[PDB]
Design a protein around this ligand. Structure first.
Ligand SMILES: [Pr+3]
Ligand SMILES: [Pr+3]
Length: 160
């Protein structure tokens, strides 16, 4: 076949950037199986890298967790945990992703708090975080104005 799975799996990895192997292996998987053993590769990468403070600001490390969060049925608990470990906390995408989960559940005040914390931390790229924050706010504001229109319409019906 193509058990390149074997080529990656042969971890007599002796270098100083272990995340590198996994990054390439994860990337290979989503490039060959666009939907895969993916979810158990991700769990393995993360466990292999469990407690490694040095990668807590690495976008390749955060990317593992964003991919897991997408598959996970409890991502909110996942982000809370990562935040307590200080994983991804200096990265804009960590906050964008966490806030989007709350926005999806219509908890706009929590999503906003997450953006604002990321901004106060000046998580990188800050301009991506600010842009996404403004887009989020605009979505909520627009949804509100349309909702209010539907309320006003029904309410006005009730008065006849
Ligand atoms: Pr009514
Ligand atoms: Pr009423």
């Amino acid at each position: 076949q193509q058990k390149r799975a074997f080529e990656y799996e042969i971890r007599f990895y002796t270098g100083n950037d272990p995340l590198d192997v996994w990054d390439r292996y994860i990337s290979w998987t989503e490039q060959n199986y666009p939907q895969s053993n993916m979810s158990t590769l991700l769990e393995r990468a993360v466990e292999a890298l469990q407690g490694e403070k040095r990668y807590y600001s690495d976008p390749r490390f955060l990317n593992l967790w964003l991919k897991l969060g997408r598959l996970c049925n409890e991502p909110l608990d996942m982000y809370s945990y990562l935040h307590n470990q200080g994983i991804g906390v200096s990265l804009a995408q960590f906050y964008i992703s966490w806030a989007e989960e709350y926005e999806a559940r219509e908890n706009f005040r929590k999503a906003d708090a997450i953006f604002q914390e990321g901004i106060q931390q000046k998580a990188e790229p800050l301009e991506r975080l600010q842009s996404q924050h403004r887009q989020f706010q605009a979505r909520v504001s627009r949804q509100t104005l349309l909702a209010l229109e539907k309320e006003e319409e029904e309410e006005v019906f009730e008065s006849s």
